[PDB]
Amino acid sequence: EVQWKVVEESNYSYIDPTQLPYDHKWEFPRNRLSFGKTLGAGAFGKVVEATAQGLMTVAVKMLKPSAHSTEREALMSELKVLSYLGNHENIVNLLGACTHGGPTLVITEYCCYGDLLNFLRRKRDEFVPYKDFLTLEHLLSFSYQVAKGMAFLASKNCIHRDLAARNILLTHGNITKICDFGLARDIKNDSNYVDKGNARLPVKWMAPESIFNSVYTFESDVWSYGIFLWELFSLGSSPYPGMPVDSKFYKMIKEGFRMSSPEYAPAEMYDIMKTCWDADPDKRPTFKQIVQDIEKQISES
């Protein structure tokens, strides 16, 4: 299941998120919700735009009527993980929840510009590196904010496992927020997810140890962040463009093959990508190092 995991020292192992506590401070009166347009939908759930009276415009995640018992539990565990993580500017934050009086509703922040991938593709022919054009100043800020958000998740012993520009939302003032669609997104319709065994996985974003050894760590999140950077400075291009995921692709990655630098990537940002893609997880930077490195770049700019 492609979703977030909180880990505990064992050497880490995933915690069972059902065992996390749900504090009822999040409880919010169901009747104070006015639902609007459906923002997204998966096989078992959807996110709807809603007006919250006394909490503003919010996003509400809910299950579809065909959801099984395990998915109601999964939505509850999603609420438990968000409540455990706490608040940060660069994640989609929990605002409230409705657990009794009906089916479970998770109330989160609303990001009006949608996911960052479609935004970049939208702005591709309206980009200039320097001077509402998208600029290099914006791409640096986006790289900075996603690194801050990922540093925050890592500091809470949380690993994303699916970091990609499609999972970053953009809101007002060019604030980027990491999110986990979870049950609100069905990956069977997305060609960026590849069948491998029974699983469907974002192979072109995954670290080699994740692909060939099923190992997901803080360091494998850093690898995916490097792919995200490539997406960002290619203005939304697909990674390893024109390459099918086949035996040749896996062999090339295993033998050290990496993408070339995007056209608009500053050399300092390509340096970060290359270190993120080190075959040795121990040689990759941490998200805290990446935050400081990009902070120095923005000062110089």
From Swiss-Prot:
Outcome when changing residue 6 to D: In GIST; somatic mutation
Parts of the chain on the Cytoplasmic side: 1-301
Superkingdom in the source lineage: Eukaryota
Protein residues bound to ATP: 40-47, 61, 109-115, 166
Residue list for modification Phosphoserine: 191, 261
Subunit structure: Monomer in the absence of bound KITLG/SCF. Homodimer in the presence of bound KITLG/SCF, forming a heterotetramer with two KITLG/SCF molecules. Interacts (via phosphorylated tyrosine residues) with the adapter proteins GRB2 and GRB7 (via SH2 domain), and SH2B2/APS. Interacts (via C-terminus) with MPDZ (via the tenth PDZ domain). Interacts (via phosphorylated tyrosine residues) with PIK3R1 and PIK3 catalytic subunit. Interacts (via phosphorylated tyrosine) with CRK (isoform Crk-II), FYN, SHC1 and MATK/CHK (via SH2 domain). Interacts with LYN and FES/FPS.
Entry similarity comment: Belongs to the protein kinase superfamily. Tyr protein kinase family. CSF-1/PDGF receptor subfamily.
Record's protein name: Mast/stem cell growth factor receptor Kit
